[PDB]
Structures are given as C-alpha cells and as structure tokens.
Design a protein around this ligand. Structure first.
Ligand SMILES: CSc1nc(N)c2ncn([C@@H]3O[C@H](COP(=O)(O)OP(=O)(O)O)[C@@H](O)[C@H]3O)c2n1
Ligand SMILES: CC(C)CCC[C@@H](C)[C@H]1CC[C@H]2[C@@H]3CC=C4C[C@@H](O)CC[C@]4(C)[C@H]3CC[C@]12C
Ligand SMILES: CCCCCCCC/C=C\CCCCCCCC(=O)OC[C@H](O)CO
Ligand SMILES: CCCCCCCC/C=C\CCCCCCCC(=O)OC[C@H](O)CO
Ligand SMILES: CCCCCCCC/C=C\CCCCCCCC(=O)OC[C@H](O)CO
Length: 392
C-alpha cells in the first residue's frame, strides 16, 4: 500500500526491448511457419518442432498487450487483461516450449544411438503437453477477479483472490519441477553425446597413431644402411597396418560387414600390408637397397592415395558433433536458468506481505529482466531448424 515502485525506467526500457523482440520474432517465426508447415510430419522431431513454432508464435502475440500496458505508469483495463489473460498465455506456452525442447533432445539423442504408431504416440503426447499447461493456466485466469484499489499499483498479486494466490504458488512450484526435470534431461543427453564424441576422438587418435608409426618407420628405412634396421622398421609398419585394419572407425560403425565402404577399407590395408610383406621378404634375404626400394613403393601416387583415403575414413564425422543438442543446452543456460533462479523469492513476495518495499521492488526488477531473456527463446527456437540443407 505505502510501498511505491519506480516504473520510469521500466516504461522506457521494457516496451523498447519487447518491441524489438516482437518484430524480430514475427519475421523469424513467420519465415518458419511458411517453411516447416509445408514439409510433411514423417518424424516425431518435426511433430515436436511444429508444436514449438506455434507455441513461439502464441507467446510473441502476447508482447503487444505487455508493451502497451508496461508503457503506462499506472494500472488500467489493459494491465488487468495482461494480468488475467495474455501474461498467463505467455507462461503456459513458455512451459510448452521447455517440454518440447526436452522431447526434441530425447529424440535427437535416440537418433545418435539408432543403427506409424510412434507418430500417433508423439501426437497424443503433444496434445497432453498442451492440455496439461492449459489445465494449470485456467484457474490463474479465473481467480484474477479483484479490481485494483490503488491506480498506481500494477502488481497482478493485488488482483487475485485468496485461492488465486494459493493456486499461483502451486503453479509456480509445478513449473519449477517442469523446468528442472527438462533441464536435467537436456544435461544428461548432452553429457552422453559429449562422452560419445570424446570416445570417437580417441578411436580416431589411436588409428592415426598407427599411421604415424608406419610413416616414422618408413623414414628409418630411407636413412638405413643395413638389413637389421630395415627388417625392424618393416615389422613395426606391418604391425601398425594390421592393427589399423582391425579397427571400426566412427564412419564405418553403422555399415554392413559386406558393404563396399567396409570392403574398400579392409582391401586398402591388404594392398599396403602386401607391399610391406614384399619388402620384408627382401630384408630377410639381406638385400637392403631392394628392401628399401620396395618399402619406398608406399610413396607411389597409388599407395599415397590409398593411405589418404584410409586415413580420411578414420576421421571423426559430423554425426558425432550434435549442434541441435548444444543449441538447446545453450538456450536453457541463457534463456531459462536465470528466470527460474529469480522466480521462487519473487513468488514468495507475491503470495505473502513478508518483504520490505525495496526488497520486493528489487525482486520484481530481476524477474522482469530475466523474463525478457526467457522471451528470446521464442525468437531463437526456429534456429534449431534454420541450419540444415532444406533452408540452404
Ligand atoms: C501454467 S500457467 C502459469 N505458470 C506460471 N509459472 C505462472 N506464473 C505466474 N503466472 C500467472 O500469470 C499472471 C502474471 O503473474 P506475474 O508475472 O507473477 O505477475 P506480475 O509480476 O505482477 O506482472 C498471473 O495471473 C499469474 O498467476 C503463471 N501462470
Ligand atoms: C487452448 C489451447 C489448449 C489450444 C491448444 C491447441 C492445440 C490443440 C494445438 C497447438 C499445436 C498443435 C500441433 C501442431 C503440429 C502438429 C504436427 C502434425 O503432424 C499433426 C498435428 C500436430 C500435433 C498439432 C495438433 C494440435 C496442437 C497440439
Ligand atoms: C546487465 C544489463 C541489464 C540491465 C537491466 C536493467 C533492469 C532495470 O531496468 O531495473 C532497474 C530499475 O528500473 C531501477 O529502478
Ligand atoms: C482462455 C479462456 C479463459 C478465460 C477466463 C476468463 C475468466 C474471467 C472470470 C472472472 O474472474 O471475471 C473477472 C471480472 O471480469 C473482473 O472482476
Ligand atoms: C543478467 C541478468 C540479471 C539481470 C537482473 C539485474 C537487473 C535488476 C536491477 C536492480 O535490481 O536494480 C534495482 C535497484 O536495486 C532498486 O531496488
């Protein structure tokens, strides 16, 4: 009552910040709807991605009501409407987005491990997420039935009934659980994909160590003047080559044993081992120069091409680098983590008259600032689909 909140910086900074996000958001999701809704829903990912684009658009359409109500220093019918309807829509569509981001992450993680009634399952799941958030949101709209007694007081908590304040606390608790379960899912999925990347790296580095062994021992043969040194190097080269021939590099992981990719990889080593074997036979006969000339045959255009090819097959592919799961984890840390940290103390100040005026106002400014970061997601989310061959 006696407490005053300074809205002079709020009425210039936030409507200006949200106006930018409204136009940036309309053009981003407009050029996402007209593209993604043309393509068919043949996978769960695209079903989840289509739900994400419309939940983004619903929360962007919420911004004009906010911009113009926050532009006014005092309360009014529009501020009451924001409190009761449009800002409630913002929150329930925000947790719809977080739910589908958690689902997209599970989907994308399961695709990395991978060597219709599931579309139905994804569709029913999509309906259940929307209906559930709507179920929680509806009493918040209905229990914001009180009129503002002081025209200078714009806080939604003063427009609420006793059970309205109770439900507000319950809803904000459930949403904290929805956030942290989805954040945990994203953290786990990211850690498992990152472990797989590090595992793919060591298998490539082990394989490349074999090539270094073979090429280092070839240098020894060139600078040698005796059959004992040539035989030693040739033996280590044969062992490195036969070791490398037994490997299943990340590019050959999901390939059939009788597939041409698997066959060319093994045959490439048979040609190089064969050349080492011919040079080793000569080294055993004490013919140093002849064994050096035959080992030097690995430097021919043909055998250098065979090496370059086999080494290329051993490299870590794009599949192992998941930019979609990294973007989602980046989005949770930037857009959602600060708001969810700022929320509980702010909810506590709204449901009980326990904090000092300046303490309350500080909690408001922090939640208002972090809520804006949360709104970037609606303008960021289409970039999970924007970086692929379909959009060039
Ligand atoms: C599932 S729907 C949902 N989820 C939340 N986490 C919510 N947190 C707040 N709301 C509602 O959205 C409206 C605005 O609440 P706040 O943003 O807490 O109010 P102000 O800081 O005073 O602008 C109120 O009717 C709240 O009950 C929420 N609604
Ligand atoms: C008042 C509130 C609860 C209204 C919610 C509207 C709901 C019913 C809407 C919003 C987003 C929609 C989804 C958008 C995209 C797809 C993918 C498509 O392959 C099948 C339908 C499906 C799965 C839609 C079904 C209906 C849907 C879940
Ligand atoms: C960090 C940059 C973000 C700055 C966000 C400023 C938030 C704000 O406006 O709160 C100040 C309040 O108005 C004071 O009376
Ligand atoms: C989405 C539809 C839900 C709309 C819910 C709106 C229900 C509002 C009912 C109400 O509490 O009326 C308040 C009155 O208009 C002011 O004092
Ligand atoms: C970066 C995100 C955190 C942004 C939150 C920090 C901005 C809040 C500004 C603030 O709290 O200043 C008000 C002043 O203390 C009067 O109570």
């Amino acid at each position: 009552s006696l407490c005053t909140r300074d809205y002079k910086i709020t009425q210039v900074l936030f409507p200006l910040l949200y106006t930018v996000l409204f136009f940036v958001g309309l053009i981003t999701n407009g050029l996402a709807m007209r593209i993604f809704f043309q393509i068919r829903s043949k996978s769960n990912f695209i079903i989840f991605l289509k739900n994400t684009v419309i939940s983004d658009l619903l929360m962007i359409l919420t911004f004009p009501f906010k911009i113009l109500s926050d532009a006014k220093l005092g309360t009014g019918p529009l501020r009451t409407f924001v409190c009761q309807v449009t800002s409630v829509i913002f929150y329930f569509t925000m947790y719809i987005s977080i739910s589908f981001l958690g689902l997209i992450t599970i989907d994308r993680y399961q695709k990395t491990t991978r060597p219709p009634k599931n579309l139905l399952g994804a569709k029913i799941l999509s309906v259940v997420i929307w209906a559930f958030m709507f179920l929680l949101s509806l009493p918040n709209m209905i229990l914001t039935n009180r009129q503002p007694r002081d025209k200078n007081v714009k806080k939604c908590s003063f427009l609420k009934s006793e059970f309205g304040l109770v439900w507000h606390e319950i809803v904000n608790y459930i949403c904290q659980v929805i956030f942290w379960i989805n954040f945990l899912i994203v953290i786990v999925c990211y850690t498992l994909i990152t472990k797989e990347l590090y595992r793919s790296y060591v298998r490539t580095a082990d394989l490349e160590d074999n090539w270094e062994t073979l090429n280092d021992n070839l240098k020894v043969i060139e600078k040698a003047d005796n059959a004992a040194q040539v035989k030693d190097a040739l033996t280590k080269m044969r062992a490195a080559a036969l070791d490398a021939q037994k490997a299943t590099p990340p590019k050959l992981e999901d390939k059939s044993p009788d597939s041409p990719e698997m066959k060319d990889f093994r045959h490439g080593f048979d040609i190089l081992v064969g050349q080492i074997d011919d040079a080793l036979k000569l080294a055993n006969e004490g013919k140093v120069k002849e064994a050096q000339a035959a080992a030097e045959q690995l430097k021919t255009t043909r055998n250098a091409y065979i090496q370059k090819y086999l080494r290329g097959v051993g490299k870590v592919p794009r599949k192992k680098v998941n930019v979609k799961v990294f973007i989602i984890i980046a989005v949770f840390f930037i857009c959602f983590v600060p708001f969810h940290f700022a929320r509980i103390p702010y909810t506590l100040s709204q449901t009980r008259d326990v904090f000092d005026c300046t303490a309350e106002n500080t909690l408001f400014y922090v939640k208002e600032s972090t809520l804006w970061l949360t709104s970037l997601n609606a303008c960021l989310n289409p970039f999970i689909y924007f970086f692929l061959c379909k959009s060039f």
